[PDB]
Structure formats: C-alpha cells, structure tokens
Design a protein around this ligand. Sequence first.
Ligand SMILES: Cc1cc2nc3c(=O)[nH]c(=O)nc-3n(C[C@H](O)[C@H](O)[C@H](O)COP(=O)(O)O)c2cc1C
Ligand SMILES: Cc1cc2nc3c(=O)[nH]c(=O)nc-3n(C[C@H](O)[C@H](O)[C@H](O)COP(=O)(O)O)c2cc1C
Lengths: 419, 419
Amino acid sequence: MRDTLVLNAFHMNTVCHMYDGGWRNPADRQVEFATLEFWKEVAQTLERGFFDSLFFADVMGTDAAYGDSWDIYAEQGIHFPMHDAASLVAALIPHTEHLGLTFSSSVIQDHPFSFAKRASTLDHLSGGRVGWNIVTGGTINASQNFGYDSLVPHDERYAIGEEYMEVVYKLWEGSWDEGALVADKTKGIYADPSKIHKINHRGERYRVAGPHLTLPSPQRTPFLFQAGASTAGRAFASRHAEATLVLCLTPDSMRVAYKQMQELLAAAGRASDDLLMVQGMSFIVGSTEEEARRKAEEQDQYLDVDALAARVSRDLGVDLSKVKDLPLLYSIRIVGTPETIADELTEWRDAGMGGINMAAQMLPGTDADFVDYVVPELQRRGMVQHEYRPGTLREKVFPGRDRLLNERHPASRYRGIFS
Amino acid sequence: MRDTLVLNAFHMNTVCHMYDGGWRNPADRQVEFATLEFWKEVAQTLERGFFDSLFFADVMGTDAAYGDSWDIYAEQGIHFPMHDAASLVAALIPHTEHLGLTFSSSVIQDHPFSFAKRASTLDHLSGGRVGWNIVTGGTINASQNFGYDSLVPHDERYAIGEEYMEVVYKLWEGSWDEGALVADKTKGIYADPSKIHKINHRGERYRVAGPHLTLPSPQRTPFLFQAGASTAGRAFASRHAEATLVLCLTPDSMRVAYKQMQELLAAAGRASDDLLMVQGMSFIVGSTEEEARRKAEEQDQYLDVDALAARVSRDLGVDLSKVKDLPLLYSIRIVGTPETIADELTEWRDAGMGGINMAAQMLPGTDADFVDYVVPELQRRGMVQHEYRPGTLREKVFPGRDRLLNERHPASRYRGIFS
Ligand SMILES: Cc1cc2nc3c(=O)[nH]c(=O)nc-3n(C[C@H](O)[C@H](O)[C@H](O)COP(=O)(O)O)c2cc1C
Ligand SMILES: Cc1cc2nc3c(=O)[nH]c(=O)nc-3n(C[C@H](O)[C@H](O)[C@H](O)COP(=O)(O)O)c2cc1C
C-alpha cells in the first residue's frame, strides 16, 4: 500500500562518516558532531524534507589494517572518534516530532536484556519512533575491548545473532501479555501479575530470567534494520528485517538482488512486501548540469585517497599502497539537476528500490541541498510523501499496518508463549 | 568554598519510586512516568528551584522475596516496571540548561567500555552536566537477567568495583592525553595520534585494549555519586565519590557519620572538602503548621504498608508476615512551614550535611511544593543558591575548582600514564 519512496539518512556520530578526508572542506561543519546542536540542525532539515528516518551507524573499534601504523585513522578521522548513537537519539527526541530515530547497536557491545530495556524505554519516550539496525560483527579491537582473543568465526556470528533475537523478542513480545497494564488507582492494581512472565531463556550463549522490565511500548519491538550482504547475513535480513540496507552498483544489480530476497523471504515464511530494499546513495545537485558537476569538483578536492585506502584495506584486506571511484562500494553518488536525479532514481525504484539510505559528503550541505532541491521534485512526481502519516515508525513505513509486527514475523511467534 | 546546600532530586524512572502505594493518590501523576512529558515538567520545576541535579535510580531486576508469590510487586508498582535512566537523562538534555542530570548505572548491567563511551557521549551532549551513581549491587533476578546462578559475595562486589573504576578512569583520563584534538583543516590533522593510547588493561574480571573512542569531554570523568553504607562501601565512596548519598536517621547520626568519613577520606588521600554527605529527605509544606499536617494525612492514606514491607524485604532478605516508620530507611521526612523546614535543615547542615537528596511522595507535588515554598526561604537565609554558576556540574558543586578532577582523586593517577 506504499507508492512513495522511504527516505533514510545514513550518518554516524563521528567527524567523518563518508567520503574520507571530507572533514577538511572549509564549507563543512562535521567537526561539530560532538555537540547536540550540530545534529539538531541536521535532524530538523531532514524533517523539513519529510524523511522517514535518520540512522546513526556505530562501532566499538578502530584497527590498523593499513601497514602497521594506526596513524592515519586519527589524522584523517576515519570512524574515530566514535560517539554513542543511542545517547544522541534520546537527545534528539525533543528536537523532532515525526522523524524516525534509528541506530546501530551490535551484539557484543550490549547484553540483550540491557539492550532490550533501553530500546523499549526509548520507544516509549520517542512515541514509537525507534529504529534498530541489528549488527552481528565488529572489528578485532571491538572484541579486544570486551576482552576476547579474536573474532568468533563469520557464520557463528549469525548463530549468535539468532539467539540475541530469540532473547529480545521474548522480552519485547512474550513477557508482558496484552492488557497487563491496568493503572486502576481506586481498585489498587497497577499491573496484572497474571499477565507478566519470566522468560527462563537458557541457550548456548545466553541465560536470562526476565521478566522484561518495561511497560509494553508503542512498537514493542523497534523498527528493524539489518545490513547483511553475505549468505549467512542476507539470510538473517530475510528472516528478521523490515528494511535491509544494501549496496547495489547498477539498477540491474538491484533487480537481481531483489529477486534473490523475494525467494529468501518465501522460505522465511513472509510476504513479498514485508521487507524494503534500501539503497546506499549520495547526491550533489544544481539548477544547471554545470553547477552540480562544478560542486563535485569543489567537494572531491578534500577527498583523501590514502585514507579511503585505509577503510578499504580494513574491509577487503588488500593493502592498496579508477581508485577514486571506491567510495561507490559505500554509496552510489548521483550528480545533476533535480530532474536528472529523480529521472535516475525512477530506474532504481523500478528495479526494486524501496528506499534511499542517504549518506553525506558534507553536512549539513548534502542534507540541506537534497531537501531544498530534490525532495520537492520527488514530491511533485508522487515519489516522496507530502506530509507525515500519524503513528509509529512501523505504521509510517507500512501504511495499512498495525503498530505491532505482523503475524508472519518471528517476533509475533513469541506473543504469549508463557501464558 | 561551597557555602550553599546542594539540591539533588531523588527520583526513579518507575511508577512508584518512594512512598509505596502512593501512585494511587488521585492527586499524583507518577503513573505518567513512561512518557517524556511528565519528566519534562518535573525537570523544569526543579531548575526553577535552582536544583543542582536531578538523579535517576535504576535497578536491572525485580525479585520474588515476599513469601508465596511475586504478585504485590506488579499490583503496587514496587520498583517495577523499571525504565532505563540513561536514555531519559539523554532525552531531558534539550529541556534543561543548567540542571545536572544524574543516573545510577551498575557494574552488572554494562561493560566498562560501553558505559565509559555512553557517559562521555552523554557528557558532550549535556555540556558537562552528567552525574554517575556508581552501583556495585544487584538483586538475585538482575544476576539471573545476565546468566549467573547466584550473587557474587558482598566483599567481591567492591573488589570488582575497584577494577571497573580502574578501567573507566583509564579510558576517560589516560588514553587521550591533553592536546589530542587538533581540528586543523588547513593542516589536515584531526587528532595527534602520539597523544591517543590503548589502555591494555588485563585484570581479574576485565580485559580492554582501547583506546577510548570519544574526544575528551568537559568533565572527562562524569560527576561521581556513590551510596555504599557498609564497611566495604563507605570505604569505596570515601575513595572515589564527590557526593555520597547517605541515610542518616538524626542529626546526631550525621555528626557521627561525617566524623567517620573524614578519617576515611584522610586515609583515602583526600582533603575534607573533596566529598559531600548528601542526605535522603522529603518535605511536606504548608503556610501554617495545620496546613502541612493536613496534607500529610491526605497523602498517607495512600501509603501502602505491605508493599513497603515488600521493598524492605527485597533488600534485607526476610519476607514479612511503628511499622509506618520503616520509610525512615529511605528518606527523612519533615512536615511544617518553610520557617520550620529551614530551621530544621540548619541542624542537619551544622552536623555536616552538605546537600539534600530529595525524594518524592507525590509528583509533581512534592517537588513543586518544595520549589515554590521552601526554596525562597533557603535563598533568604543564604542556604540555597540564588543563581546557577557557569561551567560544569563539577564546577557547580565545587566553586573555583577546575572542570576536571583534582590530583588528590584516583582518576588523576591515570592522566598521562601512557605517553
Ligand atoms: C548501510 C550499512 C550500515 C552498516 N552499519 C554498521 C554499524 O553501524 N556497525 C557495525 O558494526 N557494522 C555495520 N555494517 C556492517 C554490517 O553489519 C554487515 O555486517 C556487513 O555489511 C556485511 O554483512 P555480513 O555479516 O552479511 O557479511 C553496516 C553495513 C551497511 C551496508
Ligand atoms: C540514595 C541511594 C540511591 C541508590 N540508588 C540505587 C540504584 O539506582 N540502583 C541500585 O542498584 N542501587 C542503588 N542504591 C543501593 C546502594 O548500592 C546501597 O547504598 C548499598 O548499601 C551499597 O552499599 P553496600 O554495598 O556497602 O551496602 C542506592 C542507595 C542509596 C542510599
């Protein structure tokens, strides 16, 4: 029932999230990420653009995969410093109203009881606007920061993933049954103890008693993002995610990738339309074609090649010591007019793109310019919403639907198992 | 030279924090705790009173210990449901300007890397206003909420304690040496990497590489609350705290307890000013003495005693089968006129009380009544600040001190130990 694209901002609580070395640009303001105010302006611009969500990536780590000198990662600010996403999201509740506030928490960096209790809390406080990107790995230092030798092997990471989701759904959906809150002052019953349960979860990595500590929140289980490119991962996204964060290079790469997920969803026991493919992207924009080309010139100066190699050389492994196109493994940039950019996005949406996962070259410039110039174009073509729909982030992304996840979704299956 | 009293509100992100059963009062609104708007009004009323801080308690478990079943903890809201204070402190940042925002986190609930990184992040975002009530405790359920058969014994909680603090101080004070941020775009250096170090902490319960992930923050180490009333604990608070939350039953009790701390502090290597004995209390005011006694009748109707017993029992092991003066275990009540409540609070201050730790019987009433009636009287008498002093919460509690902690404080030991 949703004929308009989903817009999602893809930022991270660090000086330079995307287009490495781009913190140098005199016109930039990302060096301000430490303050609440910088981000308020970015949050608000986006809600002037009717963006469905703003998403904060997050790491517990920094590593020297380039050569053997961790130098350039502090010198060019490559995902270091890293500040805590969750904390900032709470800090943005008051300076937004309908904007979805999303974040990565990983599996290693917070116990699912703690992570469950925090999510529920934010979900209450935000008024049902919380997004959760499920992360299952993290780098070496990430492990060595919570005292672990080395990484647990790739696919075990997703095994562990499943139990984490086993635990949180139990807490969010299972522990409190419907009608548990009573709030009857005269009768003297706040919460109905016959409807509030332990989980007594006992598995291979997690034991947890419960009950879950929070009142049921507006969404119960926050709006679920996952970004798994691999087999064990894509599988996981197909199983649990409401929107997967993906990076196809051509629209024909999206068409393949869409078809693939559709099969995976059917095996996972879910509808074609239960999951949005959301594309990593970025934009530069102008009135003429020449203004936008000439913007990219300006912005691409401050693009450091050696620090782009430092983020590639961690991921791929290969220690590279055209090459300038490599930020196309992180977002497909589109330069041009609003008409051009809209024209090109139509190909992607036709290839199966359900949403844009928009990153920034400069902040708040990219974000401003996309809202200022592109959003009205897309709104005119009926591709981007004119106004917010009322209700929870789930209710927004999936128009017909209930504030709670569908009966097809793994979460639903926990609803009153312990009744 | 801090010559006014500290005011700390002592609330908790739950329906009935403090005068058990009191959620039932038709005048009360603590049943609205789940929403940000209730707490926005509580926070703002406190800042209008010039409170130094608002403090959120937090447990990570409810327990069975009241005989047959766990029913009376649901029905009468006995520190259940329980919502995460961290998140709420972050969501009040925008609705407050100078008010200090404090929370209990415990050892058991969060690893000292994550917790360090969340704190420092909250501390940037707040702008130097974060408090940290250190908790080494835990009810049995909270242990079983993280996969542990039973409690570790009392002595060891504080041992584990001192390591956790040994880890967090390493990250907050040790890793990033002064002049670490550079931010020079012309030059192209975000952080001097010679000044950013792994902590390489390998102790009893913990291993952590670091480095810490956040830019050094205004306070660096958040402002430190501690509550340990036992041997191990006082000794712990004497060693690490800036303000200890205590429960002295009588001013004679404070005079003794204050004397004791000053020996513990001297042994702990600290000057006598370096920590504040902040007292648990609760006021009911009126314009005559008959007005305030009349209020105290009206509220105490709704004071449940069996529920009170059930919280006493959670803490002291034994399930029960005057008794209405068991609430002197949690806060000392004063009813009367503002003349009375200032006259009486002088005695406490003269016996060594450096701040009040004010809990609510109703909200927003108890706080509003204290702010509207008592505060003006204390400001007359030079007992309570007229106007917020600029700088951090450290700088607000200790006039003319640095934003950072003193060289007499354990945290300082860690400054520089890696270059
Ligand atoms: C758009 C996007 C955002 C991501 N954000 C994070 C993050 O915030 N934290 C993190 O540890 N990993 C992050 N990742 C890495 C993913 O969790 C994922 O593990 C990776 O893309 C490959 O998944 P796989 O586990 O299927 O190999 C992100 C990936 C993508 C594509
Ligand atoms: C004012 C006050 C607030 C407290 N808040 C919390 C809290 O939020 N969470 C928690 O687990 N324990 C809390 N406690 C429990 C303390 O850990 C308690 O003082 C206990 O006695 C620790 O000292 P001990 O271990 O020496 O007995 C609090 C105690 C006091 C006095």
